[PDB]
Amino acid sequence: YFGKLESKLSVIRNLNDQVLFIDQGNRPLFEDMTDSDCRDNAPRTIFIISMYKDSQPRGMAVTISVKCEKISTLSCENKIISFKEMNPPDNIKDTKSDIIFFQRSVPGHDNKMQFESSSYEGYFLACEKERDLFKLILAAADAAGDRSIMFTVQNE
Incomplete structure (x- = not known):
């Protein structure tokens, strides 16, 4: 069972310092953005x-x-990343949820974070280059040094 406690606004960057944003197709991508880009593309970057x-x-x-457009919540349902148009619920009855990730400090890096799927143990949010795009994906990762699953989370 999960119960909602408190929320915070944040910008999320991959290790290349690219900013996570939701694009026109409702898909999560990373792009190089200045702070001002970031702020001017709020709320798609926040x-x-x-x-x-x-x-x-x-x-x-x-x-x-x-x-x-409305609130959309990140899901890793069926091991694929997508957004569900829904508010983070007040509670979730199960111990495994496709919208619940475990945020962990990266071993040997105080300031970087991983997000492990609660549904699929050993699978993590990651950045993958695909052609010309940097996408958010769910990836199996066994090694703490894996740079693809490391993110910076800055408050507001």
């Missing part, structure tokens, strides 16, 4: 990270959402 209490504690449980 993510809401909501903390949840967990009846089966395995880390800091969070949802990630964004207010593009």
